[PDB]
Amino acid sequence: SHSVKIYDTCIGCTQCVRACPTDVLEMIPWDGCKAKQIASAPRTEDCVGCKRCESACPTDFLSVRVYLWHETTRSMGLAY
């Protein structure tokens, strides 16, 4: 649906995942930062697009990055 691609500037603070209201993101093991973890995005099909993940990303610009794309009923926040 959407396209939540993340970048290697992530520091493993786990705030993008702790803000995500749809479990799009999840921390995985990684070796590119002091915290030794990075935030994957398997459940991109559940992404509403609220960009709470990148309103909580403490990088110079951003590491998690939501690119709005084809809108499905899960991505249009529809309970009907």
């Binding site: 609220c50 960009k51 709470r52 990148e54 309103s55 909580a56 990303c57 690119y67 709005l68």
Partner: peptide, 14 residues
């Protein structure tokens, strides 16, 4: 440039 010409915004963040 990665978001195209017409896109709504970039969220309330920043």
């Amino acid at each position: 440039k990665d978001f195209g010409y017409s896109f709504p915004c970039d969220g309330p963040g920043r």
